[PDB]
Amino acid sequence: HHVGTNTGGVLVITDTIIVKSGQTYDGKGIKIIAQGMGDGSQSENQKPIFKLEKGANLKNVIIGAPGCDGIHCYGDNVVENVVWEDVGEDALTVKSEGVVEVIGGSAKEAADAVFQLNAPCTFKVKNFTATNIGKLVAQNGNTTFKVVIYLEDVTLNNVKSCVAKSDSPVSELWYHNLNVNNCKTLFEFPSQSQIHQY
Numbered sequence: 001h002h003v004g005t006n007t008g009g010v011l012v013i014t015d016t017i018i019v020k021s022g023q024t025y026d027g028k029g030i031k032i033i034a035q036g037m038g039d040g041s042q043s044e045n046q047k048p049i050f051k052l053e054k055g056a057n058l059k060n061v062i063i064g065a066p067g068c069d070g071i072h073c074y075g076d077n078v079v080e081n082v083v084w085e086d087v088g089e090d091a092l093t094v095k096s097e098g099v100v101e102v103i104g105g106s107a108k109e110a111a112d113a114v115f116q117l118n119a120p121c122t123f124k125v126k127n128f129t130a131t132n133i134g135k136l137v138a139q140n141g142n143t144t145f146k147v148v149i150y151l152e153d154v155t156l157n158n159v160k161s162c163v164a165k166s167d168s169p170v171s172e173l174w175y176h177n178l179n180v181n182n183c184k185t186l187f188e189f190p191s192q193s194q195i196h197q198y
């Protein structure tokens with residue numbers, strides 16, 4: 001496990017990092033601390049640490065407290081080996097349509113949702129651990145567009161509300177090698193038949 005060459009460095013930022021289409025931001029293990037962008041509370045007007053435009057990728061960062069409004073993803077994004085040490089309002093939001101994959105990494109201390117889906121998308125969480133969270137995935141409340149969520153090799157500990165919540169009857173959640181400890185209720189969807197294994 002060659003840890004990255006920026007490991008032990010801390011980057012203090014005062015504005016959102018914008019990653020453009022076709023660009024990959026590779027932090028090489030850098031820890032990011034945002035200043036002036038939010039306190040990581042549940043206040044809904046914090047800034048994102050990263051804005052990933054459509055077709056942008058992000059890898060190998062640690063997001064330190066304050067988690068602010070985390071990572072905004074505008075579709076067709078891969079987010080690989082990102083560690084949220086203390087999730088802010090949420091960890092990652094899907095803001096526009098496309099495929100978004102979170103592969104590797106982990107999240108801890110989400111007072112409410114880790115992943116927030118606000119546009120129709122295909123959303124995959126793979127090889128991921130999260131501890132002390134309200135929900136792993138939430139589709140924006142009272143919306144009825146379609147998301148399809150895949151949880152593959154995911155381990156969850158201490159889930160206060162549920163693994164995933166959606167108010168959309170057309171949305172679907174598919175899981176494969178999902179391990180959950182200390183969780184209220186697994187899935188808050190209009191019908192449990194929207195949830196499938198594979």
Ligand SMILES: O=C(O)[C@H]1O[C@H](O)[C@H](O)[C@@H](O)[C@H]1O
Nearest residue numbers: 044089090093116118140141
């Ligand atoms: O964090 C977010 O994306 C969301 O959080 C809340 O659910 C809010 O009601 C939404 O409109 C959106 O702001």
Ligand SMILES: [Ca+2]
Nearest residue numbers: 044089090116
């Ligand atoms: Ca929110």
Ligand SMILES: [Ca+2]
Nearest residue numbers: 086087109110
């Ligand atoms: Ca937190």
Ligand SMILES: [Ca+2]
Nearest residue numbers: 069089090093
């Ligand atoms: Ca948010």
Ligand SMILES: [Ca+2]
Nearest residue numbers: 042089112113
């Ligand atoms: Ca919230």
